[PDB]
Amino acid sequence: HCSLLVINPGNNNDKQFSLLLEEYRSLFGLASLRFQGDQHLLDIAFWCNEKGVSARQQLSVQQQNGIWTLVQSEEAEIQPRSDEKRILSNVAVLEGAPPLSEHWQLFNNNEVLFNEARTAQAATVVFSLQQNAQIEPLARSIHTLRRQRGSAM
Amino acid sequence: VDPVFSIGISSLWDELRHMPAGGVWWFNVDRHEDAISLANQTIASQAETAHVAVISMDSDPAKIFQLDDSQGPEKIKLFSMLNHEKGLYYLTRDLQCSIDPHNYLFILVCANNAWQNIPAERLRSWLDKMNKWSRLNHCSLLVINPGNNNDKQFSLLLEEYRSLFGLASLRFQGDQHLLDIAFWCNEKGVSARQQLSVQQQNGIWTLVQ
Amino acid sequence: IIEIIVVCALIFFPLGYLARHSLRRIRDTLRLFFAKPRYVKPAGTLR
Amino acid sequence: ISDIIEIIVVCALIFFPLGYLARHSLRRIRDTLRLFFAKPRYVKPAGTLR
Numbered sequence A: 001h002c003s004l005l006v007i008n009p010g011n012n013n014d015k016q017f018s019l020l021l022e023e024y025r026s027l028f029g030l031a032s033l034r035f036q037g038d039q040h041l042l043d044i045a046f047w048c049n050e051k052g053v054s055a056r057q058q059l060s061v062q063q064q065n066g067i068w069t070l071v072q073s074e075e076a077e078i079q080p081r082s083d084e085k086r087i088l089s090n091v092a093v094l095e096g097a098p099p100l101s102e103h104w105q106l107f108n109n110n111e112v113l114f115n116e117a118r119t120a121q122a123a124t125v126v127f128s129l130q131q132n133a134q135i136e137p138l139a140r141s142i143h144t145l146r147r148q149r150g151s152a153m
Numbered sequence B: 001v002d003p004v005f006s007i008g009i010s011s012l013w014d015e016l017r018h019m020p021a022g023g024v025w026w027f028n029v030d031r032h033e034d035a036i037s038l039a040n041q042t043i044a045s046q047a048e049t050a051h052v053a054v055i056s057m058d059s060d061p062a063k064i065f066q067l068d069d070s071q072g073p074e075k076i077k078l079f080s081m082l083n084h085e086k087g088l089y090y091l092t093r094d095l096q097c098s099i100d101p102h103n104y105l106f107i108l109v110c111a112n113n114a115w116q117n118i119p120a121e122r123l124r125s126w127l128d129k130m131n132k133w134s135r136l137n138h139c140s141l142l143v144i145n146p147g148n149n150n151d152k153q154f155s156l157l158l159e160e161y162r163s164l165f166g167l168a169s170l171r172f173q174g175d176q177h178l179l180d181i182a183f184w185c186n187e188k189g190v191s192a193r194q195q196l197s198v199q200q201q202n203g204i205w206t207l208v209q
Numbered sequence C: 001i002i003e004i005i006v007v008c009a010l011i012f013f014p015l016g017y018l019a020r021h022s023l024r025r026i027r028d029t030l031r032l033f034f035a036k037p038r039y040v041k042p043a044g045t046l047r
Numbered sequence D: 001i002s003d004i005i006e007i008i009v010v011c012a013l014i015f016f017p018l019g020y021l022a023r024h025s026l027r028r029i030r031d032t033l034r035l036f037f038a039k040p041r042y043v044k045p046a047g048t049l050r
Helices: A014-022 A112-117 A134-148 B032-044 B085-096 B118-136 B151-159 C002-021 C022-033 D004-023 D028-036
Strands: A030-034 A040-049 A050-065 A069-070 A086-088 A103-107 A122-124 B005-007 B018-020 B025-030 B052-057 B076-081 B106-108 B140-144 B166-172 B175-185 B188-199 B206-207 C041-046
Touching: A014 A030, A014 B166, A014 B206, A040 B166, A040 B188, A050 A134, A112 A134, A112 C022, B018 B140, B018 B175, B025 B032, B025 B118, B032 B052, B032 B140, B032 B166, B032 B206, B052 B085, B076 B085, B085 B118, B085 C022, B118 B151, C002 C022, C002 D004, D004 D028
Parallel strands: A086 A103, A086 A122, B025 B140, B025 B166, B052 B076, B052 B106, B106 B140
Antiparallel strands: A030 A040, A040 A050, A050 A069, A050 B188, B005 B018, B076 C041, B166 B175, B175 B188, B188 B206
């Protein structure tokens, strides 16, 4: 129950890179970072975690004052869509009707729902609006969900 | 050194066709006729020197699985089992008794809704043991499951992406079929979440580009 | 006497170690010979 | 002669589990020896850089 982070500084590991590509069975994820003058191109051939498997993703990052920040192309594919059928809805949306399927999960308000949706990747999130006072906080929650959990949601 | 095999869909890319022996791949199909057609096309699409076996349920396998007279291996080792969970439980020992399983491909065509009664925990254990046995004996296992409402089972399979080496599904859409490749791990790389359309022309699965 | 007893001891020791190392091999060969297929019965090699 | 053969067979058998149990518990024996002392060599813990 331990995790290992292998950091390999190399310049001509093309044969080694092909070997590591073949070595899926011993590697959860193979990631490569390439310096290109001003920014770093992140090329993840494949990557796996508890949220699925992503394969053949190329991203751009830059080192600003020693920190690694992703470039504003933060709309890159959230490859795994495992909860494409899960419906996370406020309890008020269903006006007392029973949940239609096993895919419906109900929540009491639009703050527990936001907390659960911060972990989803392709689910349908249904908010309920009953007062004008909760438009700005709902707008902020929707903004955070859209800017962090990608376009598949 | 161990040969790699191919899936039975024509006009398909090698990235999603090749299965290097030593893992478990899983397939779902909407209808039983689709399952049998895919199994027959896989059998007819194998190299001559390859060693392939077929396990069937609730039928006599000598009458439902065919072979093309122009392509494929010279002979296949048909098998048969009871429509029961114990057959899948004993599959490894039963195959070891009658065959040396090193460098083999095993097609397992189950019955309609056969995998409906297997509990989730025992399915996880079965997948883990099959993966370990496949790595130990350098054999590949392809599972073709004709089913309807395996969404819970499909989520279970997705959670077990370590055990499996590839999960794909085939859905009926009237005139064409939709291929959903959840992931695939072969010699030429790893894929993730494609969607492709395949048709059935004269009993042959051909990809429509 | 005791000398030949110790000789046999040594022999059977790595002999029993090599036999244990081939546990998997022994198991497979025995399964091939006795051959108990309890549920999966080979219908027949089709042409 | 007969007694000699008998003792030979006895020794043979006893040393079969002697070499069968030695291999069976081999993995556990190495484990026990390690924590006793073995030799933590090569890689050396630098310190708890708090």
